[PDB]
Short mmCIF file of C-alpha atoms in Angstrom, two decimals:
data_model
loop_
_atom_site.label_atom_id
_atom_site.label_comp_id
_atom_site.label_asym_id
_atom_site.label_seq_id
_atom_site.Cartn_x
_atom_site.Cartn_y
_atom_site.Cartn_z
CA UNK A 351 -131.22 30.66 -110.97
CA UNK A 352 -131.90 34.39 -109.62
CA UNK A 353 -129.52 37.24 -110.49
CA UNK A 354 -127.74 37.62 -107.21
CA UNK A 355 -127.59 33.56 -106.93
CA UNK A 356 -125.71 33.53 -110.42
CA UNK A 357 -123.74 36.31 -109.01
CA UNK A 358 -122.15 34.94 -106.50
CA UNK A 359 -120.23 32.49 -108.49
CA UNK A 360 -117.80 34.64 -109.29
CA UNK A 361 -113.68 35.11 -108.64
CA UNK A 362 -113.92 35.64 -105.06
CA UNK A 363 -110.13 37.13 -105.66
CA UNK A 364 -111.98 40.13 -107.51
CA UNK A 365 -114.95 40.66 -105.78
CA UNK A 366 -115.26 44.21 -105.47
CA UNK A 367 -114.36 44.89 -109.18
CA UNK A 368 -117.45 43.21 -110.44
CA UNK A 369 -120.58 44.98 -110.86
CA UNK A 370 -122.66 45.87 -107.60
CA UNK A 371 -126.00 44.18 -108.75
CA UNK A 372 -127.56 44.24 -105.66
CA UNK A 373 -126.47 47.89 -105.04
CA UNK A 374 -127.92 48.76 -108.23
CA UNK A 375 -131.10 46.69 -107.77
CA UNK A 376 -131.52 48.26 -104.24
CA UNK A 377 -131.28 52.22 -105.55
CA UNK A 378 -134.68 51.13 -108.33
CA UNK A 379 -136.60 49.38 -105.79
CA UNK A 380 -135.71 52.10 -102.85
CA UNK A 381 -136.48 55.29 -105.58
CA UNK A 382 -139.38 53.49 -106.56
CA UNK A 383 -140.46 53.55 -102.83
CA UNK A 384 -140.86 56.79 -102.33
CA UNK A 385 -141.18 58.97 -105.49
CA UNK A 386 -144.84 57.13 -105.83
CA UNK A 387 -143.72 54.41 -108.03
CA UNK A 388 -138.88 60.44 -113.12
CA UNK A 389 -135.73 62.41 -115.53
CA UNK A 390 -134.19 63.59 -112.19
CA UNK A 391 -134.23 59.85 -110.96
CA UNK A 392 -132.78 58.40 -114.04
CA UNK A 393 -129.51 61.11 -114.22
CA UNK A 394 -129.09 59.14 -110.46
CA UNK A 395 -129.15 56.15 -111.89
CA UNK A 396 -127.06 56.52 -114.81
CA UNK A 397 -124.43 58.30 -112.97
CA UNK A 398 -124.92 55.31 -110.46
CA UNK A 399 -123.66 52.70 -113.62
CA UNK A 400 -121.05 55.31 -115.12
CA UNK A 401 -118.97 54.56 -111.22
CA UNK A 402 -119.91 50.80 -111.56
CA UNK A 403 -118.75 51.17 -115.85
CA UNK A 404 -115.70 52.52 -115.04
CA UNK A 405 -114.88 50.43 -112.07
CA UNK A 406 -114.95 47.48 -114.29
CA UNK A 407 -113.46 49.26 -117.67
CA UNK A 408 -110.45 50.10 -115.30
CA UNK A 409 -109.56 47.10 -113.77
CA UNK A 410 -109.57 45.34 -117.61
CA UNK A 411 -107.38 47.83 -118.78
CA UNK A 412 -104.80 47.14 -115.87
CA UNK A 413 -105.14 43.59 -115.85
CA UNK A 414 -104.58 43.44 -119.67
CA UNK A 415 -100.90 45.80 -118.93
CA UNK A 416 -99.97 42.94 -116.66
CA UNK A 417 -100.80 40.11 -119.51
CA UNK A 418 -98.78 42.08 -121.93
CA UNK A 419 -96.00 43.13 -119.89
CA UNK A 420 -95.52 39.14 -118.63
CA UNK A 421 -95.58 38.16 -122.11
CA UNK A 422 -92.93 41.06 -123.55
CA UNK A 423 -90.52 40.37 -120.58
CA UNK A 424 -90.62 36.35 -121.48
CA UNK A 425 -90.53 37.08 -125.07
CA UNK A 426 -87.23 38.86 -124.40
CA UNK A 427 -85.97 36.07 -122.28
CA UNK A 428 -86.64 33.51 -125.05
CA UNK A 429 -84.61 35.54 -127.49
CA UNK A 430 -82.06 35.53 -125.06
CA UNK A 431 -81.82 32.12 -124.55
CA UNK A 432 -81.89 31.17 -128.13
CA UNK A 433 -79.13 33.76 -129.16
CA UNK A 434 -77.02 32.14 -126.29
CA UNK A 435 -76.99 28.71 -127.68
CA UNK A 436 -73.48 28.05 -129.86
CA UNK A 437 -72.37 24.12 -130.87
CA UNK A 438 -74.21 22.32 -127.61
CA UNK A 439 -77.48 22.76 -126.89
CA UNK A 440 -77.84 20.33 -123.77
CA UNK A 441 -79.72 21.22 -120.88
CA UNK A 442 -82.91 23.26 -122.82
CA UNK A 443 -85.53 20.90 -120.87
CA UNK A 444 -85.21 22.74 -117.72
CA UNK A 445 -84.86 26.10 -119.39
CA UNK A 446 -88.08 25.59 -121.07
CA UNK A 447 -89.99 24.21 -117.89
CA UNK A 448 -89.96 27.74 -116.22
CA UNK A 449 -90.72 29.78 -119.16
CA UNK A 450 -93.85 27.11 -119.76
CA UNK A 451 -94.50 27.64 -116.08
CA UNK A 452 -94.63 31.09 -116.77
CA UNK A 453 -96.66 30.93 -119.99
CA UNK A 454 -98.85 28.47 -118.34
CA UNK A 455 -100.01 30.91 -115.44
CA UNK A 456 -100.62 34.33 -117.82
CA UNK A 457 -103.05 31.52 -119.94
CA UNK A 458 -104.69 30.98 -116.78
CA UNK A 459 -104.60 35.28 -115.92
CA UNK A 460 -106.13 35.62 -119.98
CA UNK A 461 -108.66 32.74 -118.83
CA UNK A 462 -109.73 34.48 -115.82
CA UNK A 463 -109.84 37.91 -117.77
CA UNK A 464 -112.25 36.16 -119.86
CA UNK A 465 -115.01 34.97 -117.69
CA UNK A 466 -114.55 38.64 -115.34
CA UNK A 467 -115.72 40.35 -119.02
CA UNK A 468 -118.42 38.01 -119.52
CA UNK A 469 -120.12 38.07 -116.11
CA UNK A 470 -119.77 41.56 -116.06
CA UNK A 471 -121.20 42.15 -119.71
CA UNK A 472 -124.29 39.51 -118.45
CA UNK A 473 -124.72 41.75 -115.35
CA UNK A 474 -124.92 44.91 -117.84
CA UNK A 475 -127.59 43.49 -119.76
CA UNK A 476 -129.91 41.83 -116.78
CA UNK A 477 -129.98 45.28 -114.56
CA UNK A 478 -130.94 47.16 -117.90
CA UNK A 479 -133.60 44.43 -118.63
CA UNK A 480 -134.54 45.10 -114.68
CA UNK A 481 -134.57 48.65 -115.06
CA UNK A 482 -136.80 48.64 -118.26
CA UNK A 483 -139.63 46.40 -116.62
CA UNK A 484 -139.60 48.38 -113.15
CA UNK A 485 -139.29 51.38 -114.97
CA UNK A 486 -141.14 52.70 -117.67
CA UNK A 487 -137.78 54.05 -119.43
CA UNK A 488 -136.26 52.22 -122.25
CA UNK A 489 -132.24 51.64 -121.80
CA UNK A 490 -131.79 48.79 -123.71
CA UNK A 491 -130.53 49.56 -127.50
CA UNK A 492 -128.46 52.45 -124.96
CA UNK A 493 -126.24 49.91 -123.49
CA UNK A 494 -126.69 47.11 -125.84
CA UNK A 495 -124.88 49.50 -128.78
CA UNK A 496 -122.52 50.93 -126.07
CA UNK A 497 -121.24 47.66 -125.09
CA UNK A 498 -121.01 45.42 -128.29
CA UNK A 499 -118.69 47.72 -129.84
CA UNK A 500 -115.21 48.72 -127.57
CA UNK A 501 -116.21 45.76 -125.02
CA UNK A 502 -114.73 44.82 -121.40
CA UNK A 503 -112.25 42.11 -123.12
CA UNK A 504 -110.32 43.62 -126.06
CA UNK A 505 -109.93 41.92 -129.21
CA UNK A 506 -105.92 42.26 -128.64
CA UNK A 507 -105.98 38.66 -126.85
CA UNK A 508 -106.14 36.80 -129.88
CA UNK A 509 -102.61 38.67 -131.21
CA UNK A 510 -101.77 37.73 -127.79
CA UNK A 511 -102.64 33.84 -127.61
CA UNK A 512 -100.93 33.42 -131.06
CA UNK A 513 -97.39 34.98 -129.65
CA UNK A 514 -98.19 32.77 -126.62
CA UNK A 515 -97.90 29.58 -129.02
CA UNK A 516 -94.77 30.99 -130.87
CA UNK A 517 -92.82 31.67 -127.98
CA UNK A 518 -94.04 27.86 -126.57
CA UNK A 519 -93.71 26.39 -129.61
CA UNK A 520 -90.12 28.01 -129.73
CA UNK A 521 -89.10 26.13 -126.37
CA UNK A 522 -90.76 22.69 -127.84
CA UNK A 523 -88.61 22.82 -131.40
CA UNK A 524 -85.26 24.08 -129.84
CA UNK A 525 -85.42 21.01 -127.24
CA UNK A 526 -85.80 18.14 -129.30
CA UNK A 527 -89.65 10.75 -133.86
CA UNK A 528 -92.89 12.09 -133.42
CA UNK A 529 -95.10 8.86 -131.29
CA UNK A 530 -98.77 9.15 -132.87
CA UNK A 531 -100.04 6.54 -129.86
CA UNK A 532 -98.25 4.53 -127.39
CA UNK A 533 -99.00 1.51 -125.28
CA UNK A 534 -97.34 0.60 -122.59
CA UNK A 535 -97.56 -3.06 -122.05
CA UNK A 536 -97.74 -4.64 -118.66
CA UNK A 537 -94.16 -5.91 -118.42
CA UNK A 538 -93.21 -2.18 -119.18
CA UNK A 539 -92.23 -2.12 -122.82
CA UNK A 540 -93.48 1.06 -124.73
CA UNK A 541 -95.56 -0.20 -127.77
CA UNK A 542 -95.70 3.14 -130.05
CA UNK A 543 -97.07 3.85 -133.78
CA UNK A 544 -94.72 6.33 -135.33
CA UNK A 545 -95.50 7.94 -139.24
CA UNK A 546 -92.07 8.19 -140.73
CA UNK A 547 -89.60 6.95 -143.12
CA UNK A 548 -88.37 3.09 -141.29
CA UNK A 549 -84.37 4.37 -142.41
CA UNK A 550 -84.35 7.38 -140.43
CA UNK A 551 -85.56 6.30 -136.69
CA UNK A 552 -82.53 5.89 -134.40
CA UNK A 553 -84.26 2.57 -133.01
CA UNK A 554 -81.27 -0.25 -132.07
CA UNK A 555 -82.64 -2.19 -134.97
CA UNK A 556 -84.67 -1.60 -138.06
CA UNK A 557 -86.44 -4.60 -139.38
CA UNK A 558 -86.53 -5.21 -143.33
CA UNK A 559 -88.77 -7.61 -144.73
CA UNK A 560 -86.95 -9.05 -147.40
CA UNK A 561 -87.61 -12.58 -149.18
CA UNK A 562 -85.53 -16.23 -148.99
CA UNK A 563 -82.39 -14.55 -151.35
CA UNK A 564 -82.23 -11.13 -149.20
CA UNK A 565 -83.69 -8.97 -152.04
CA UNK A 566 -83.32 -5.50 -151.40
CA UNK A 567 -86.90 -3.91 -152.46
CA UNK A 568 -90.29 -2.62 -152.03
CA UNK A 569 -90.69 0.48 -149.90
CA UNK A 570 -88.66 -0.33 -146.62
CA UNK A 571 -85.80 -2.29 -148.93
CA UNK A 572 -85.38 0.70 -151.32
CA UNK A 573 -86.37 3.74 -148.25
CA UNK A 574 -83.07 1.74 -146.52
CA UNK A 575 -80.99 1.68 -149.21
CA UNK A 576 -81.59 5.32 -150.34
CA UNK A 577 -80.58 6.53 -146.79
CA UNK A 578 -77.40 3.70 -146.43
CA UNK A 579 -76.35 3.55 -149.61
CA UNK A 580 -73.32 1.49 -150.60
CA UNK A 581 -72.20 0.66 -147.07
CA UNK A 582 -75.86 -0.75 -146.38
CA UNK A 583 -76.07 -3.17 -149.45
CA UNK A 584 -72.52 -4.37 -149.20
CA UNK A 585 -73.49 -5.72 -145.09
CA UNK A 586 -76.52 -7.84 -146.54
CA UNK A 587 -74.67 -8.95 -149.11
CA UNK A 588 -72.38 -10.29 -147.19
CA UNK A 589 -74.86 -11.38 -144.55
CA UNK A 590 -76.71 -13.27 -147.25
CA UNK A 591 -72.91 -15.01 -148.41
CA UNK A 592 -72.88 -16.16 -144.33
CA UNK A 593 -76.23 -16.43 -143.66
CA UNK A 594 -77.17 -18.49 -147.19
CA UNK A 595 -80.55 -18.37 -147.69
CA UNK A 596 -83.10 -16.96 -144.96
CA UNK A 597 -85.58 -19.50 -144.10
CA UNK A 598 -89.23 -18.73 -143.86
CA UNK A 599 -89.75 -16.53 -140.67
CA UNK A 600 -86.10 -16.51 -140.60
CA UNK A 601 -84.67 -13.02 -139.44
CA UNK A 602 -80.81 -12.48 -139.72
CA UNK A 603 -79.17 -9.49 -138.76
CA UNK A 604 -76.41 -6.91 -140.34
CA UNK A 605 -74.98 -3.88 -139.12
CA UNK A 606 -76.72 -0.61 -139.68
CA UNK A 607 -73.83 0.68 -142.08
CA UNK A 608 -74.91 4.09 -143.71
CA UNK A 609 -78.32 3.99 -141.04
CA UNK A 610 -79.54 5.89 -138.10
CA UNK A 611 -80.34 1.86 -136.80
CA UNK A 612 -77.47 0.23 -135.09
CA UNK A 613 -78.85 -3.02 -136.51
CA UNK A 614 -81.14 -4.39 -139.50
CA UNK A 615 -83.17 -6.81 -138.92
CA UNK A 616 -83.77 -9.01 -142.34
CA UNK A 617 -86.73 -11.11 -142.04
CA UNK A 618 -88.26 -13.47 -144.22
CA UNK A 619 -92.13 -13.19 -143.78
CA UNK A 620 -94.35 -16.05 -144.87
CA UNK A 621 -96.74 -15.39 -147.86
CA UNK A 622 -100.72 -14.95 -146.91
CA UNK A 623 -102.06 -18.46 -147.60
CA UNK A 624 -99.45 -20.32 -146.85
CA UNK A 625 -100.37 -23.36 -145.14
CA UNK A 626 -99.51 -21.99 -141.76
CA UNK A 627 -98.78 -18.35 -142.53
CA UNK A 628 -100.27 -16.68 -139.58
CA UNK A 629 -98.00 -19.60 -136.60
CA UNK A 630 -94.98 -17.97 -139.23
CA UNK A 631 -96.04 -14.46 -139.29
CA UNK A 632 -95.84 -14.55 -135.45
CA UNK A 633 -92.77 -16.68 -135.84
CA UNK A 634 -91.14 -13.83 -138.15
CA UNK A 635 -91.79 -11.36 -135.56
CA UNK A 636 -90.27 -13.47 -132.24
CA UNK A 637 -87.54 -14.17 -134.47
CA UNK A 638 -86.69 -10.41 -135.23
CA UNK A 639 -87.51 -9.73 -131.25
CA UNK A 640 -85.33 -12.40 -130.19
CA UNK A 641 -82.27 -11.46 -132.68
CA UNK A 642 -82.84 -7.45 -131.37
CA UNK A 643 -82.29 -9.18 -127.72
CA UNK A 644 -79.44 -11.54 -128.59
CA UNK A 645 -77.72 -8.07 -129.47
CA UNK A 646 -78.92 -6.62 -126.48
CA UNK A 647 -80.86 -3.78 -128.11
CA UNK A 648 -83.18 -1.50 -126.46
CA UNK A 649 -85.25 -0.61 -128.75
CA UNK A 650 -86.81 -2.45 -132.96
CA UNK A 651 -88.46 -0.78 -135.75
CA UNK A 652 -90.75 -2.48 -137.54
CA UNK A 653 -92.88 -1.62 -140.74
CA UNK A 654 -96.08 -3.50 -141.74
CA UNK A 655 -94.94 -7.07 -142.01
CA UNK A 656 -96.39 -9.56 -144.09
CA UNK A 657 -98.84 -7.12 -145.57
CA UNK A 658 -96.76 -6.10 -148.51
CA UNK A 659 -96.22 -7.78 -151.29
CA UNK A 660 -96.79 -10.92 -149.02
CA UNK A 661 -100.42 -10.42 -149.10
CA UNK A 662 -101.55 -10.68 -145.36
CA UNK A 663 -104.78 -8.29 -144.61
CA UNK A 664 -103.51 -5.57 -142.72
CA UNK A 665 -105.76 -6.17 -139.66
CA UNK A 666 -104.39 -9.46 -139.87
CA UNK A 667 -101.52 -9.02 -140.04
CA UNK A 668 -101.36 -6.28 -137.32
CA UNK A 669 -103.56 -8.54 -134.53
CA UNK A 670 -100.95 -11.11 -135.47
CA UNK A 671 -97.59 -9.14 -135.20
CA UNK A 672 -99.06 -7.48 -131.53
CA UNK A 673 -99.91 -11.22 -130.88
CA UNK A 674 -96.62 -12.37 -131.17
CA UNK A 675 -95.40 -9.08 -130.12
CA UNK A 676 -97.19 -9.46 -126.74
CA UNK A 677 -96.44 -13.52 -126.22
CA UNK A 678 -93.07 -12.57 -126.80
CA UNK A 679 -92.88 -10.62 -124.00
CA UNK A 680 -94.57 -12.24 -121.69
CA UNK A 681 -91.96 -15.36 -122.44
CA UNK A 682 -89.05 -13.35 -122.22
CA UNK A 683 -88.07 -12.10 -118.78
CA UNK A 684 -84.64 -11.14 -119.72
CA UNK A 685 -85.43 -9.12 -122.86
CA UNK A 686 -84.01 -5.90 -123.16
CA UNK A 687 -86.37 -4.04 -125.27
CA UNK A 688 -87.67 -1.40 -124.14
CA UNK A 689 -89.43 0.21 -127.00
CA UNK A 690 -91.10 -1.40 -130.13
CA UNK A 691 -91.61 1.17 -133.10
CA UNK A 692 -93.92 0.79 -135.47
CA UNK A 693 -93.56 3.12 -138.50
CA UNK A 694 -96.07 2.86 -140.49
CA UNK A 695 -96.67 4.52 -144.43
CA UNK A 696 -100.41 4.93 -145.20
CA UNK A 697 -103.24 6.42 -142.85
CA UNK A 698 -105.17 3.11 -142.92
CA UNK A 699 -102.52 0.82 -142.13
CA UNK A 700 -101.82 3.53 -138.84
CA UNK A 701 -105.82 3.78 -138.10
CA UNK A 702 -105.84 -0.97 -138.23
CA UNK A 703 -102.46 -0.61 -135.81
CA UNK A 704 -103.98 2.24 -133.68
CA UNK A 705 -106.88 0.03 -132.82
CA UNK A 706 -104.99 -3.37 -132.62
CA UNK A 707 -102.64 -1.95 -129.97
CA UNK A 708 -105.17 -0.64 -128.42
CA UNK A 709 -106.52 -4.29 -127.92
CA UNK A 710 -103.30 -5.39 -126.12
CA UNK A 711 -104.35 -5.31 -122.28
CA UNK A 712 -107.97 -3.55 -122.25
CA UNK A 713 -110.76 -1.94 -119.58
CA UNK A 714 -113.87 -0.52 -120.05
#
């Protein structure tokens, strides 16, 4: 609440750089003693907050050479690094740690910069305010000018915070999906909503909602054929010449010829209004989970099933797939997947799967 109170919660690490408030409140109310409550008194007192001005104008100016030299030195290792990499670029997680280490502990030296300058520029301004209702002299549009233009932090940190990004976001892009949310569910499998095209996720198995006949269609059908071309058609074809037709909630698998997926899932989703099309739309899903486990697999991208073509409310469909997802998974002990992708097209459809998987296993 008071001035010195407010003081003293400042970085004990730098106490003697910060402005002597106390010292400077003491040399008014001391002078005020004795001359009988003058010019002569005020040169004192300005040459008094010229010592304490440069005290603190100094130690900004060196503590913003050790911000910039920390960041040119890593700046140089990063281009080192980078113009060292040739074929294999294996082991950049560990490489990256220490320059984030590094990184991470000048943001913290720029943070602590910060709040020295604006203590400091507060302490300016209340032992002016001081010194203009104990004394009859007027400093305030003085120091108030004096300080708002070339001030105790330079504008140079924002050029600064922006080549603190680049080099960081140079160690994120040169290590490495994209996971939009994840849930982990209690039995340990990793539940995660993913925006991208189905085709081109290295999951074990992509699933492809296709009808009784194996038709190759609609967004997932034709984003899987684009990417697997020839290779991809010919394996369902000849999955649907074995297979025969896919029963309702049937799934039947193929390889992932021409695919990032190892496997592709073909599943036959009922139709919204079908006499029991939600029991099969949960059906659909165990049937694709247990096919992706009969294989082994470790991980199974799906897309919005059932609320295609096949008309199921997305909600719906959603509470229903994580239904069956969930139930699935607490029935199966000796599954092996780990991860369950969803990759999803449209913001809404991510926003109704966001908030249904956030549903599985919740606390206040």
């Amino acid at each position: 609440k008071f001035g010195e109170h407010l003081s003293k919660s400042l970085i004990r690490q730098y106490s003697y750089y910060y402005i002597s408030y106390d010292d400077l409140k003491t040399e008014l109310e001391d002078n005020l003693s004795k001359n009988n409550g003058t010019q002569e008194l005020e040169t004192d007192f300005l040459e008094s907050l010229e010592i304490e001005l440069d005290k603190v104008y100094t130690f900004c100016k060196v503590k913003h050479s050790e911000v910039f030299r920390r960041v040119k030195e890593v700046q140089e290792q990063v281009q080192h690094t980078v113009r060292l990499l040739d074929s294999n670029n294996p082991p950049t997680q560990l490489d990256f740690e220490i320059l984030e280490e590094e990184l991470s502990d000048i943001i913290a030296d720029v943070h602590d910069l910060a709040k020295f300058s604006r203590l400091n520029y507060t302490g300016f301004q209340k032992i002016i305010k001081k010194h203009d209702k104990k004394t009859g002299f007027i400093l305030k549009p003085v120091f108030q000018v004096r300080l708002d233009s070339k001030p105790f932090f330079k504008e140079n940190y924002d050029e600064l915070v922006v080549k603190i990004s680049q080099l960081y976001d140079i160690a994120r892009t040169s290590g490495a999906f994209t996971v939009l949310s994840t849930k982990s569910l209690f039995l340990g499998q990793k539940l995660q909503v993913v925006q991208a095209d189905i085709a081109s996720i290295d999951s074990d198995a992509v699933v492809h909602p296709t009808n009784t006949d194996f038709y190759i269609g609609g967004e997932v059908g034709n984003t899987l054929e684009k990417k697997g071309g020839k290779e991809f058609v010919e394996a369902v074809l000849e999955l649907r010449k074995k297979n025969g037709p896919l029963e309702v909630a049937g799934a039947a698998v193929s390889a992932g010829h021409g695919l990032p997926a190892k496997f592709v899932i073909h599943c036959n989703s009922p139709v919204w209004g079908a006499d029991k099309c939600e029991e099969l739309l949960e059906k659909t899903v165990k049937n694709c989970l247990a096919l992706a486990d009969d294989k082994k697999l470790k991980s199974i991208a799906f897309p919005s099933i059932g609320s295609g073509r096949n008309g199921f409310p997305k909600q719906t469909a959603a509470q229903l797939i994580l239904k069956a997802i969930s139930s699935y998974f607490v029935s199966t002990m000796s599954s092996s997947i780990k991860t369950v992708y969803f990759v999803l097209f449209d913001s809404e459809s991510i926003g109704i799967y966001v908030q249904e998987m956030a549903k599985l296993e919740h606390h206040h």
